[PDB]
Design a protein around this nucleic acid. Structure first.
Ligand SMILES: Nc1ncnc2c1ncn2[C@H]1C[C@H](O)[C@@H](COP(=O)(O)NP(=O)(O)OP(=O)(O)O)O1
Ligand SMILES: Nc1ncnc2c1ncn2[C@H]1C[C@H](O)[C@@H](COP(=O)(O)NP(=O)(O)OP(=O)(O)O)O1
Ligand SMILES: [Cl-]
Ligand SMILES: [Cl-]
Ligand SMILES: [Cl-]
Ligand SMILES: [Cl-]
Ligand SMILES: [Cl-]
Ligand SMILES: [Cl-]
Ligand SMILES: [Cl-]
Ligand SMILES: [Cl-]
Ligand SMILES: [Cl-]
Ligand SMILES: [K+]
Ligand SMILES: [K+]
Ligand SMILES: [K+]
Ligand SMILES: [K+]
Ligand SMILES: [Mg+2]
Ligand SMILES: [Mg+2]
Ligand SMILES: [Mg+2]
Ligand SMILES: [Mg+2]
Lengths: 446, 442
DNA sequence: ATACATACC
DNA sequence: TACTGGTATGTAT
DNA sequence: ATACATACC
DNA sequence: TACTGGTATGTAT
């Protein structure tokens, strides 16, 4: 089914008829170049699954036994270090962009809406999700699913502004909170909770926009956070409260929209939560990882744990280590400060460009935008990468690393232009037929 | 209603079109503000007509002599020695999109969004669809209309390809926008008289050879543009820029027109020319002059004395140049810019903290634009449009120049603060904000 | 170091 | 008519 | 120097 | 559902 076939792994999308919805998507997508490319990618994934299953058939009882012991040794060390003492909160705005648009055009409140264009949606409101409409779906497809759908263009500066208002509230509870995008954040409220236990009602009191008082527990802190967000912005958030970031993230989606959920911070509660948790609900387990694990009979975190020996023989160390943490209900119990960025990039999609001189011009423009962006943070990098996507949706990237760092439109373009030239020359006399180009700079000195 | 002063919009059922536009527009906030602006123009027309009725024979006679004196100097210096070309791409953005998606060449299309179109192709223009009209209205006029989102970087790239051709014929050509330019081909015509066929042969992408006349040069330019970019241009040839621009529109699209450089050809062209065809005569000026019985450049000349009493010096000087078929005969290099701005429309913002943040973001973009050209300025102006489409601008000027996001924002935020305080306790209900910097050291 | 894929919002 | 854009990282070479 | 209006693409 | 954005300059205070 790939990308196109409805992805219901999002809040507010339970109980839909994927057979009926996918017939509509397929009718709207039939014969397109996008579809052609999706079939190619699906066949790739299936080959990868086949290679894993062939490797699996070679595994013997002896090997599995040995892996089992080595994995259980590592699990014992993870288990002994389990930290249940931090209160991690994940805050996540409800239908963020759509909610802002509905707030400011209340005629939209009772309608199914989405934000974006006929080419692409960035989100949808909860009414629209009941028709299968969602982020990453083209608007023209969404309209087939929901003829009455209102598609609203984005107002990115508004969303940055709302986000600033939210973050100012969040800073009160964890001044080192980790903002992930505009609409979500992790907080460690451990310290705050400790101080809060001796705060008089005056420091936990808010007037409505007659006053209200919030208690001293974690659930009360998060009710206070949500209340302040709603009062300041007129928008709701959901929240998860858990002993680590992995669990808190799963929890914040659970009672969406306008809800919250806490896993009590005792081991038994964690394990009972994780027990029948579908792995697709955990951050980092995407469509492909899900498909590969499903081939092994793995759908839930219990199954993930049960097959840990096998996973240690079929997946890299970074992957089976990650799976084992999930399967034990472990994750980060402290938040790290936003580090040095490793890359910066710009890319753009367009109607077909096939003339070499126009491709060079496009490349130069992208190099200039990217130089402007680097200038803002005074960064310089040693590696320039171009990205080309042809009209059949096939992506290539072509990188070059240089001895001395670069920053200016001129320097970036002198590298990118050569990378592009090499591609134009390779297909000659056939023009490159492009729908997207991008330029990325990386290898900043650390 | 339908502003039909464009190529391809001749002989439309404007009755039907204006009904559809009007059903789509009446009752809106937009329409409310249009009525207010139309009333202000009508008031301005009424003030003028009441002034006109007080003008004496003696006043008219004194004006007439001053204007005739000024017209003598203008006529004396009439310069017919330069061949000025105006090049203008046909349906520019739409043509680019049709070029690169074959399914579109036989359909009505427009470029932009459901909120706003930047242009339309000639098929769509037959339904009254055009630039400056919202796509949602265009779709009522033309259900089958294809609205293509813009690809601005492609248009810039095509413009570069076009400008490279134009530099062969006049290296000091003046680019006016992405799709249009003025060239002075006088020098090139001198050189070209003695050029062998080798220097005037271009192959189709079979050879083609072009002659030595101005018309043949412009054919050669238009042929080259179509071979390089796959798009057509129209062109106007004339002794000055004012006339050249009129001519480029005359046989649009994919056409060409010349006014030969003799006084008589200029006057026969100008004679029954509707004034609205001249660049700088917009809707408002046209309506005011129509109120005086002025539709053509002939009528504009005749009422020159009256024009000098009813209009500022700048305006009647300008009208007089037009009525004599005069204009620029040498093209200046693009001088120092006078300002830089950014503005943006959004769904309603009414919370003061959000308004400050938008102002901040706008100030950063603007500092970024300035940093690119290393410019600093002393005047910062904010622009606020409310949900009833009313525009306010508020400026402040400082001693020493500024350029950083912080400096620009320090000034802008106090201007915004003043507007928020003046309406308190009612919030400002905005649909647009902008920031502009000006007063560069020149 | 480079190419391509996966994942997230 | 029309299938996004920015950053990090995993996998494989 | 400031505010608002017109014009162009 | 939905009426643009950038620059210059004219009109009036
Ligand atoms: N594929 C995508 N492409 C572009 N923008 C996207 C996107 N996915 C999301 N965004 C933008 C638009 C989103 O509004 C915003 C936050 O992402 P979420 O928190 O994942 N989604 P939301 O808040 O809408 O709904 P809820 O949390 O209740 O499920 O990021
Ligand atoms: N009101 C507007 N708003 C935004 N962009 C606009 C615009 N009007 C035009 N443009 C953009 C899009 C336009 O394509 C481009 C050139 O403007 P023209 O030469 O005045 N119009 P075209 O070339 O389309 O048609 P033809 O010359 O055959 O009459 O500028
Ligand atoms: Cl889809
Ligand atoms: Cl098919
Ligand atoms: Cl739409
Ligand atoms: Cl915005
Ligand atoms: Cl390619
Ligand atoms: Cl209109
Ligand atoms: Cl559309
Ligand atoms: Cl360019
Ligand atoms: Cl230009
Ligand atoms: K191709
Ligand atoms: K208002
Ligand atoms: K206002
Ligand atoms: K498509
Ligand atoms: Mg969200
Ligand atoms: Mg989120
Ligand atoms: Mg044009
Ligand atoms: Mg033009």
């Amino acid at each position: 089914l790939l990308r196109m076939g409805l992805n219901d792994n999002k809040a507010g999308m339970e109980g839909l008829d994927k057979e009926k919805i996918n017939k509509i998507i397929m009718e709207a997508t039939k014969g397109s170049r996008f579809y052609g490319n999706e079939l190619k990618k699906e066949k790739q994934v299936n080959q990868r699954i086949e290679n894993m299953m062939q490797q699996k058939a070679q595994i013997t009882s002896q090997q599995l036994r040995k892996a089992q012991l080595q994995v259980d040794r590592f699990a014992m060390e993870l288990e002994q270090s389990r930290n249940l003492s931090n209160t991690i909160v994940h805050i996540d705005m409800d239908a963020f962009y759509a909610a802002v648009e509905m707030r400011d055009n209340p005629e939209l409140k009772d309608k199914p809406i989405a934000v974006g264009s006929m080419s692409m949606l960035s989100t949808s409101n909860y009414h629209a999700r009941r028709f299968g409409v969602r982020a990453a779906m083209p608007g023209f497809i969404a309209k087939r699913l929901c003829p009455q759908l209102i598609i609203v263009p984005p107002n990115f500066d508004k969303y940055r502004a709302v986000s600033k208002e939210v973050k100012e509230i969040l800073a009160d509870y964890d001044p080192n909170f980790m903002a992930m995008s505009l609409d979500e954040a992790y907080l460690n409220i451990t310290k705050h909770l400790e101080e809060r236990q001796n705060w008089p009602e005056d420091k936990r009191r808010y007037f409505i926009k007659n006053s209200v008082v919030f208690g001293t527990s974690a659930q009360e802190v998060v009710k206070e956070i949500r209340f302040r967000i709603e009062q300041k912005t007129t928008l709701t958030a959901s929240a998860g409260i858990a002993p680590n970031t992995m669990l808190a993230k799963v929890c914040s989606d659970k009672n969406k929209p306008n809800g919250q959920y806490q896993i009590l911070p005792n081991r038994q509660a964690v394990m009972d939560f994780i027990k029948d948790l579908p792995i697709r609900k955990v951050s980092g387990i995407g469509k492909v990882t899900e498909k590969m694990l499903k081939a092994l009979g793995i759908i839930t975190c219990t199954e993930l744990y049960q097959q840990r020996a096998l996973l240690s023989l079929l997946f890299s160390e970074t992957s089976w280590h990650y799976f084992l943490h999930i399967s034990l209900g472990l994750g980060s119990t402290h938040l790290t400060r936003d580090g040095e960025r490793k890359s910066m990039s710009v890319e753009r999609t367009f109607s077909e460009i096939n003339k070499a001189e126009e491709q060079y011009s496009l490349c130069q423009e992208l190099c200039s935008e990217l130089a402007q962006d680097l200038q803002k943070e005074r960064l310089k990098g040693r590696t320039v990468t171009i990205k080309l996507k042809n009209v059949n949706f096939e992506v290539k990237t072509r990188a070059s690393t240089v001895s001395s760092v670069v920053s200016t439109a001129e320097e970036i373009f002198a590298i990118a232009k050569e990378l592009l030239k090499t591609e134009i020359d390779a297909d000659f006399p056939h023009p490159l037929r492009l729908r997207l180009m991008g330029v990325r700079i990386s290898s900043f000195p650390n």
